[PDB]
Amino acid sequence: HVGTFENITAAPADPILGLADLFRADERPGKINLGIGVYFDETGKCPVLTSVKKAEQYLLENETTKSYLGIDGIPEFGRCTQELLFGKGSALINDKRARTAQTPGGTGALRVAADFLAKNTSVKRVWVSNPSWPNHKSVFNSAGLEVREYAYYDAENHTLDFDALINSLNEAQAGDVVLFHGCCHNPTGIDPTLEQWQTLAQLSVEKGWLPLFDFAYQGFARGLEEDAEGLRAFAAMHKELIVASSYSKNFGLYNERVGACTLVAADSETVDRAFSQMKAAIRANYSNPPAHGASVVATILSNDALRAIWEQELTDMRQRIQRMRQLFVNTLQEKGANRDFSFIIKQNGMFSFSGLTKEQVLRLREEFGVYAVASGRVNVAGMTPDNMAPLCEAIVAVL
Amino acid sequence: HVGTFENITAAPADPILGLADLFRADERPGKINLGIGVYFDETGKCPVLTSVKKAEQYLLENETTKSYLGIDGIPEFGRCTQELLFGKGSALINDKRARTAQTPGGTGALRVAADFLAKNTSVKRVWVSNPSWPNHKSVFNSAGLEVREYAYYDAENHTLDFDALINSLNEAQAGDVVLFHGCCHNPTGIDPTLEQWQTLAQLSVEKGWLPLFDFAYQGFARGLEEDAEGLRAFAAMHKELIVASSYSKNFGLYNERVGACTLVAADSETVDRAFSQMKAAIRANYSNPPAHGASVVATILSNDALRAIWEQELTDMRQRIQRMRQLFVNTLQEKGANRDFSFIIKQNGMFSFSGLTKEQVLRLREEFGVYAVASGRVNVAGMTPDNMAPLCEAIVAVL
Ligand SMILES: Cc1ncc(COP(=O)(O)O)c(C=O)c1O
Ligand SMILES: *Cc1c(COP(=O)(O)O)cnc(C)c1O
């Protein structure tokens, strides 16, 4: 009677999280963490938004029960989500072509979609960008879906390689899923222009793809409505699509696990039929979703006063990151870098590829106490006026 | 192109959660909800516990960040969970043989265990009592495991059929998983005696089963420690086991999704190796767990003054249910029932198997507005002094 657990092989280190335990252990003073994807403020802290604290006080005074939510969560949460993604007065909403389930984070939204697709459709293949968020492949593989990669980044020009993106998707067939980042591509910060989004929307229709949008950073590129232009171009042309969205970053609600999976089909009758199977996939996973984070979002979005506070806090975050992008480039020059880092200014969101090699990312860590993901992705929101000069001196030393 | 969603078949209703939907829509003022397993107080409400409101007020004023938890959640939540399960000073704890992940509810803990087994071991079959919670089968089937049923309930004598149980399980092979309810069996309310638990533990070892304990009602049968006696007899003999526990009910934190998956192995090296893969399965599901409800639990169990308040609140819930069981049986005789219902006094927890047929349950709903599960399972914790007479009048009218 051998043990069931004896033949188990240890799992490797998570590329984004295996770094953060290694940082908490580093006993050297002045270590700098440019790793995980949370926003920091000017003091190097990840604070709770004021609008979130106000909403939580209201919930504390007014909640009378913790009784289970429905499988698909708080109804007002789904309605507010659809307005954010598609626009108030969107035809998708008036025609009742969309259904939204509240999920545990954006990751939970991707997993719910994966399980739904694997069990209820003939989907076998998901196409994701090279590079992408590393957990994309793990989520879809957990449902038994093959993940293929399409070309995306021109590492010479630090730009979108649009010709190669098109050519690399030539073999994506009708009924394959193609995954797009809605804005603030993770990790490159390079997003399609509006004309490129429109080109992709037309191509997607002709080839019969099922688009799946991962929308974790709405509001961090240009603004809430501007950042959804690409999704709304797809939505104007497609009968069917899926949107996995996250409120982890734009509400600073990371650890409360607040996301949404939104299904769109040709008509009300079809999406309700499909959504009933998505609810069955949720029930066999975590049963029903956590209330606290989504109650906060629904409260803020339903209250004109709180929503005005939140939108300003989101603008404040967006502008800080842009300020840091400029300061990073200026300070690298001041500290003597001869490589041109000006592409950094053109990139959107929290993350840019620095262009550093795994070998330089390792030298920064072991020699200077500066922590970046081994792909060379650095979190610009982890940079402050206080840590920018040491950080830049370190990069310049390993160049 | 024909749509990917066009030919999806609609999912059937959940036998528990679909009932709740019907109950909401029912416009009759006298309707009575004996379906879903939530606790109601003497006034028919599902309250937030006082210990929980106090912990939530502490969190509101002292939380400074919502930054992601680690994949396995709050460390103190895991330590407190193991103490509750195995007891302060257990050798599993001092030998470092146990690892706990915070999960989204007991359901999420079940799905995480199932995914982990399916993807990292040779396990193929899970054995589940007949009857059991209806969602057990969906969770294990959705992870790719086969579900087999073992005998349990003697429907004529309203008792545990221990000879049938043991002969059923002689077909379970070594390396199969056998699922046990820790206490307050759902739906029958009939649990093994300590002497039967000890018989099963010895037998489990001889045959090479991997025990999986589902522990959603610790404290609702006799007490916190007494309700863990059967699990602790297993933990005394086995090299390996899995416990999926829930805080939904004994903390009234249903909609915050608070549970734990606890892995036990032969030694520290093996459990950490196994746990590394469990973390991978979580990362590919919901990434990391929701903080609010687990933080409430850990605040309460970590503070003797809050813990004392909570323990009294749990005792009060347990005693109120015991008072309704007696009131239920006495009132049925007063209302003209000629059958003996005294077996309800011998059942533990929220649920009693009433012995009503599907046709009688349907008639209770349609004609009297009394909602029970089609199996005839009734939630005693939904009974109150005020609704007892009409409820019993309805049941007598359909006998
Ligand atoms: C036996 C059993 N297992 C699991 C669960 C699920 O617990 P949770 O709501 O925390 O997911 C329940 C509660 O409904 C239960 O009765
Ligand atoms: C961070 C991130 C997620 C995960 O969002 P959570 O809400 O934390 O689960 C998903 N997709 C992308 C592209 C991300 O950057």
Numbering used by the authors:
A (entry chain A), B (entry chain B): -2 to 396
Provide excerpts from the study.
E. coli aspartate aminotransferase (AAT) is a pyridoxal phosphate (PLP)-dependent enzyme that catalyses the reversible transamination of l-aspartate with α-ketoglutarate, yielding oxaloacetate and l-glutamate. During its catalytic cycle, AAT undergoes hinge movement to switch between an open conformation, in the ligand-free form, and a closed conformation upon association with substrates or inhibitors. Using our approach, we enrich the less populated but catalytically active closed conformation in order to increase catalytic efficiency (kcat/KM) with the non-native substrate l-phenylalanine, leading to altered substrate selectivity. Steady-state kinetics reveal kcat/KM increases of up to 100-fold towards this aromatic amino acid, resulting in a selectivity switch of up to 1900-fold, and structural analyses by room-temperature X-ray crystallography and multitemperature nuclear magnetic resonance (NMR) spectroscopy confirm that the conformational landscape is remodeled to favor the target state.
We crystallized WT, HEX, and select variants from the Closed (VFIT and VFIY), OpenLow (VFCS), and OpenHigh (AIFS) libraries. To obtain structures in the absence of maleate, we applied a rigorous crystal soaking method to serially dilute and extract the inhibitor from the crystallized enzymes. Superposition of bound and unbound structures for each variant confirmed that closed library mutants VFIT and VFIY remained in the closed conformation in the inhibitor-free form, similar to HEX, while OpenLow variant VFCS and OpenHigh variant AIFS adopted the open conformation, similar to WT. Overlay of AAT structures (Chain A) in the presence and absence of maleate show transition from open to closed states upon inhibitor binding for WT, VFCS, and AIFS, but not for HEX, VFIT, and VFIY, which already adopt the closed conformation in the absence of bound inhibitor. Interestingly, the amplitude of the open/closed conformational transition that occurs in open variants upon maleate binding correlated with their computed ΔE values (VFCS < WT < AIFS), suggesting that this metric can be used to fine-tune this enzyme conformational landscape. Furthermore, DynDom analyses of all variants confirmed that only WT, VFCS, and AIFS undergo hinge motion upon maleate binding, which rotates the moving domain relative to the fixed domain by 4.6, 2.6, and 5.9 degrees, respectively. OpenLow mutant VFCS showed 19F NMR spectra that were very similar to those of WT within the tested temperature range, consistent with its preference for the open conformation. OpenLow mutants had lower KM values and were more catalytically efficient than WT with both l-phenylalanine and l-aspartate, which could be due to the fact that these mutants have ΔE values similar to the WT but stabilize both the open and closed conformations by >10 kcal mol‒1.
